[PDB]
Design a protein around this ligand. Structure first.
Ligand code: PRX
Length: 634
């Protein structure tokens, strides 16, 4: 156990007693609790209703603050202007540290109004989907907030997706517009963003895209399509800086994020406005102990939900200064992350176990010539953190003075679900600890029976909370199928967890067929598809194996079409194929050439033995197992 340090005790917004009192009210009386807590936002017309939700088959319906109206952008910008207009809303640090920016709330608001008008002039309307395929530059934020201001529904696509992966997202969502940049700048190198867009839009099934707006980030030679392609600067300069935000309903859709699942291709996890923003704002405030003047840095990409809730929306609703970093924590040197901390006097740092492990492998090279004294709070997200990593992070980065908040949540959950509160809860290395206000977790066996006491099982949430995803885009029936059918009347997270004698949770990872690779959520089925699309590949089974930096690696058992021979040319080729289908993020670390896939007489693939064998673990046609072991050895 780590005791709460005096300095945090002295300033904390929530102490142990307040966590107990608030947690208990949040469950016993959600309506008074979230009715009061909803006031963290400005409302145009006030809500009367608060909680109005159901996990019942086939009547899954999630509504929060439903008769209320509000604007996300007014809450994240306009309302801070009068008294804090001059406050820095975003600190931008470039890949190249010679390049930085302090954007004030007033500056940010002005550009958001301009871009809101640019979108409106382009014919974009409330409800339209807007694809954003951007690097980590302040214009992505501007684009996201402008979509929100006018009630367009934005769909941010992570910069590292391949042209094929971008096309799929645009096709599913029917995006009317793509907003991108000429190139991205990362670790001295360029991502060819706009080129990738070009390639995407050549897909014949892409039919909805009217225009591409392009930010001139590097000024590289790019192909231009006259009429379709527009420059960011050209358009924004033309636009009025004046814009009045109209009222959106609490349940007006806000964004879609394509998210990997146990079966099929990624689906558009849908979030609405009111409950989402309230949940984002509240979790940020309390979990990071946010006080005016705290300089906050979340290291997550804007193309993931952590970048949505905890780089942008939570921070800006609360009036915080939030830092956006264009680069990677270990470039030019492993000390970079701490140089950024030092340079911008970061007080709250929130990052990924994959990063921590990466800096850890380098030792004191990660902290060398740095100070780190400005830091008060650390945070970790996206994957289980091993105690040793947690210890190194606490000791080396936080100098043994900083609570570490290990925040468990998901894209589908909008905000933090199980998390320490730095002034309320005593820490255990590797534990996400206790549930947040409004959150009712439970552990059930594979049959659905609640497990009591210290125990493990399938992690479910037994009632709704405000930040919960409301649906899957254009497919509410699959939303129910996916999350509310395995354990009736419950939200199934897809994770396993254990609870200890203290009521602390230890999240042990996906129990479905979803991987965590360098903190990216990937379905095994989608990699298998990408593999099988290759004209030389008959059959593939993909499993995860432990990995000291990535957490899990992708290990692919591959069966070639009859008459095909493996080679070293083919190994790299197949890898490059998956990188083309999805992105570098999905490239398999290992390709296991085999004709010995273990199938039931019924045709089922024995995926448990594959998993065990792939992990260096040595104890219809039974003799395939033995052939698989030899092949592994070789
Ligand atoms: C939260 C931002 C990432 O959102 P995604 O929707 O991409 O991933 C959610 C999944 O990431 C893992 N995960 C996330 N945080 C933790 C965590 N703190 N501990 C263990 N596993 C975690 C859990 O397996 C979960 O089902």
């Amino acid at each position: 156990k780590h005791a709460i340090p005096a300095n945090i005790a002295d300033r904390c917004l929530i102490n142990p007693e307040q966590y107990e009192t608030k947690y208990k009210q949040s469950i016993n009386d959600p309506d008074t609790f979230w009715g009061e807590q909803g006031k963290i936002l400005d409302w145009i017309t006030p809500y009367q209703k608060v909680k109005n939700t159901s996990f019942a088959p086939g009547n899954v319906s999630i509504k929060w603050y439903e008769d209320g109206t509000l604007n996300l952008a007014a809450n994240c910008l306009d309302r801070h202007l009068q008294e804090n207009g001059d406050r820095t809303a975003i600190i931008w640090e470039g890949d190249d540290t010679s390049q930085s920016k302090h954007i004030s709330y007033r500056e940010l608001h002005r550009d958001v109004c301009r871009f809101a008008n640019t979108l409106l002039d382009l014919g974009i309307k409330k409800g339209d989907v807007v694809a954003i395929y951007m690097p980590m530059v302040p214009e992505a934020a501007v684009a996201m907030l402008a979509c929100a201001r006018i009630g367009a529904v934005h769909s941010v696509i992570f910069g590292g997706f391949s042209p094929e992966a971008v096309a799929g997202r645009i096709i599913d969502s029917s995006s009317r517009l793509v907003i991108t940049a000429d190139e991205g700048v990362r670790a001295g190198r360029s991502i060819p963003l706009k080129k990738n867009v070009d390639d995407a839009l050549k897909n014949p099934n892409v039919t909805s895209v009217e225009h591409v707006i392009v930010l001139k980030r590097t000024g590289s030679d790019i192909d231009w399509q006259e009429g379709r392609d527009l420059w960011w600067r050209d358009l924004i300069e033309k636009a009025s800086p004046e814009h009045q935000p109209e009222a959106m309903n609490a349940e007006d859709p806000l964004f879609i994020l394509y998210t990997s699942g146990s079966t099929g291709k990624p689906k558009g996890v849908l979030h609405t406005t009111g409950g989402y923003l309230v949940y984002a704002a509240t979790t940020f405030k309390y979990v990071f102990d946010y006080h005016p003047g705290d300089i906050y840095w979340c290291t997550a990409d804007v193309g993931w939900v952590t970048g949505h809730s905890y780089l942008l929306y939570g921070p800006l609703a609360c009036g915080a200064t939030t830092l956006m970093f264009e680069g990677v924590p270990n470039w030019p040197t492993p000390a970079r992350m701490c140089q950024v901390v030092d340079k911008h006097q970061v007080n709250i740092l929130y990052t990924a176990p994959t990063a921590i492990r990466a800096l850890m492998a380098e030792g004191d090279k990660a902290i060398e010539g740095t100070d780190r004294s400005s830091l008060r709070i650390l945070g970790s997200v996206g994957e289980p953190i091993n105690p040793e990593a947690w210890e190194w992070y606490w000791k080396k980065i936080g100098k043994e003075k900083c609570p570490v908040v290990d925040t468990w949540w998901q894209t589908e959950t909008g905000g933090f679900m199980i998390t320490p509160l730095p002034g309320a809860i005593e820490l255990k290395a590797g534990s996400a600890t206790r549930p947040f206000f409004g959150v009712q977790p439970a552990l059930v066996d594979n049959e659905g029976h609640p497990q009591e006491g210290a125990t493990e099982g399938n992690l479910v949430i037994t009632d709704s909370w405000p930040g919960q995803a409301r649906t899957l885009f254009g497919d509410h029936e699959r939303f129910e199928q996916t999350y509310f059918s395995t354990f009736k009347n419950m939200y199934f997270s897809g994770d396993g967890a254990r609870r200890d004698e203290d009521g602390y949770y230890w999240i042990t990872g996906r129990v479905d067929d979803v991987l965590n690779v360098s903190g990216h959520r990937l379905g095994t089925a989608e990699i298998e598809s990408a593999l099988v699309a290759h004209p030389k590949i008959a059959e593939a089974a993909v499993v995860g194996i432990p990995h000291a930096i990535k957490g899990q690696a992708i290990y692919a058992y591959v069966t070639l079409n009859h008459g095909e021979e493996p080679s070293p040319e083919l190994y790299a080729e197949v890898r490059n194929w998956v990188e083309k289908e999805i992105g570098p993020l999905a490239t398999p670390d290992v390709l296991h050439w085999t004709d010995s896939l273990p199938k039931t007489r019924s045709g089922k693939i024995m995926r448990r033995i594959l998993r065990k064998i792939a992990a260096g673990d040595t104890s219809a046609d039974p003799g395939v197992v033995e052939k698989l072991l030899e092949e592994k050895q070789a």
